[PDB]
């Protein structure tokens, strides 16, 4: 049993044998649908520049 070690990061069949959630895993979920404000702050900018 287990004569050879397969890399799950390269072998998708092993990546399915382990981690069954990998089938339903969803990446690159977009969440910038809003107005995208600019939370900079007057005090933060003055301190950031300063001298």
């Amino acid at each position: 049993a287990h004569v050879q070690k397969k890399n799950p990061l390269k072998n998708k069949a092993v990546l399915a044998r382990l981690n069954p959630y990998a089938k339903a895993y969803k990446a690159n979920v977009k969440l910038n649908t809003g107005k995208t404000p600019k939370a900079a702050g007057e005090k933060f900018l003055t301190v950031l520049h300063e001298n």
């Binding site: 799950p8 981690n19 339903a24």
Partner: protein, 200 residues
């Protein structure tokens, strides 16, 4: 197992988002938000087995950093911090991220079963070893290591020390001075992820 992995992934995203909004709120208000100090640290032994003082040799034996290019996961407390301070010239340690932990446990994940180094090719091996701690999958092991759960000691000890290869692209010009001085020794913070990336 799939439900647990989905919950863990949701927890990771929620924690990452929460830190982002807190930082944005601090920037907007002009105050300062200090985040939580790291509880998990990945340590890689960079020095060989030649010319090692007895105290540093004993500490590296207790940290299981026996061979060069070996990596371990350690919970970061006062006792561990002082041990790493003593062995600073011989190891480099930093804060691992989710990708580093999962890639390490996937490609180079080996478990200590019957005092033997067994590849983590099936979840059954992990259940047989850490079933009493509700660790039933490699994703459960990843979650336990990454979040430093109540069974971190058993999970980390079960994980055989990682036998990393020599980095692709090499080390810096001089390998045996501190990371602050321009070398590869001592604390490197998030740069351990890039070092593991080229060493994996």
């Amino acid at each position: 197992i799939a439900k647990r992995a989905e919950s863990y992934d949701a927890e990771y995203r929620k924690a990452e988002r929460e830190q982002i909004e807190l930082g944005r709120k601090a920037r907007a208000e002009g105050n300062y938000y200090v985040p939580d100090e790291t509880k998990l640290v990945f340590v890689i032994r960079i020095r060989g087995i030649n010319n090692i003082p007895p105290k540093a040799r004993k500490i590296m034996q207790l940290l299981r950093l026996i061979q060069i290019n070996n990596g371990v996961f350690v919970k970061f407390n006062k006792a561990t911090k002082e041990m790493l301070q003593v062995v600073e010239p011989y190891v480099t340690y930093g804060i691992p991220n989710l990708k580093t932990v999962r890639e390490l446990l996937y490609k180079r994940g080996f478990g200590k079963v019957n005092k033997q180094r067994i590849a983590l090719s099936d979840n059954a091996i992990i259940e047989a070893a850490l079933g009493k701690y509700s660790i039933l999958s490699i994703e459960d092991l990843i979650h336990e290591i990454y979040t430093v759960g109540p069974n971190f000691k058993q999970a980390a000890n079960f994980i055989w020390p990682f036998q990393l290869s020599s980095p692709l692209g090499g080390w810096r010009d001089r390998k045996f001075k501190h990371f602050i001085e321009g070398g590869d020794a001592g604390k490197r913070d998030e740069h351990i992820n890039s070092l593991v990336r080229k060493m994996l």
